[PDB]
């Protein structure tokens, strides 16, 4: 999944201008991911690791 | 469900480091976690497994606890104190 | 997943720390008291925190490590973890208690 390009964007938008992408047709490690403590916050509602 | 709670007072809860410490009976010293308010630094136990997480609450003061699903072992007293300084 | 495995008073006693890859210098160590929490003490391996006593040292690159007490003492009992961290994530193996 694109996920380098997302971390590493230059520019974001505004608080009311929040971007929607759909992300499709691509496979993820998610447990590396959240195996990691970079993200300060990481809450998971309504699933489970 | 239980809620375990240990809140200082008389001094700067940002500025004195809090740590928790578990210990079921019949068993040696298991740490779990400690976080750096500076930067929400958490470092996890070598045995780790995801089990709990520690969150604190700058607002309040408030440190809570909570359980993503409670087992056997989570039935034990938990050691609470104001640290070293700084 | 990436899978670790290790092996195996007064007498000599010297523990070995390992990692999936080669790490350098990037180690941590760790203090343990009868009643105290673990905590950071040296960082980067190049760095004295403050109020940390300076008999503490390492020594050794690459990827074998050695850890040697000059004088056991009866308040230097304690449990110590090794900790590497690398560009991706922080990866912890299962240690030995004492």
């Known amino acids: 999944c694109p996920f380098g390009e997302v971390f590493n964007a230059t520019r974001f938008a505004s608080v009311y201008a929040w971007n929607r992408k759909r992300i499709s047709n691509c496979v993820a490690d998610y447990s590396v991911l959240y195996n990691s403590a970079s993200f300060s916050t990481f809450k998971c509602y309504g699933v489970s690791p | 469900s239980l809620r375990i709670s240990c809140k200082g007072s008389?001094?700067?809860?940002?500025?004195?480091?809090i740590s928790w410490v578990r210990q079921m009976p019949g068993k040696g010293l298991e740490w779990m976690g400690r976080?750096?308010?500076?930067?929400?630094?958490?470092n996890y136990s070598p045995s780790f497994q995801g089990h709990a997480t520690i969150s604190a609450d700058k607002s309040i003061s408030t440190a809570y606890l909570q359980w993503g699903s409670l087992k056997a072992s989570d039935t034990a007293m938990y050691y609470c104190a104001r640290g070293r300084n700084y | 997943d990436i899978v670790m495995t290790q092996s195996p008073v007064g007498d000599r006693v010297t523990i070995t720390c390992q990692a999936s890859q080669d790490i350098s210098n990037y180690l941590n160590w760790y203090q343990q008291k009868s009643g105290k929490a673990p905590k950071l003490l040296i960082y980067?391996?190049?760095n004295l925190e403050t109020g940390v006593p300076s008999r503490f040292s390492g020594s050794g690159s690459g990827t074998d490590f050695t850890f040697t007490i000059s004088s056991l003492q009866p308040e230097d009992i304690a449990t110590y973890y090794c900790?590497?961290?690398?560009?991706?994530?922080?990866?912890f193996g299962p240690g030995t208690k004492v």
């Open positions: 008389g001094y700067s809860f940002t500025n004195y480091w």
């Open positions: 900790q590497q961290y690398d560009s991706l994530g922080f990866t």
């Open positions: 976080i750096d308010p500076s930067d929400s630094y958490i």
């Open positions: 980067d391996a190049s």
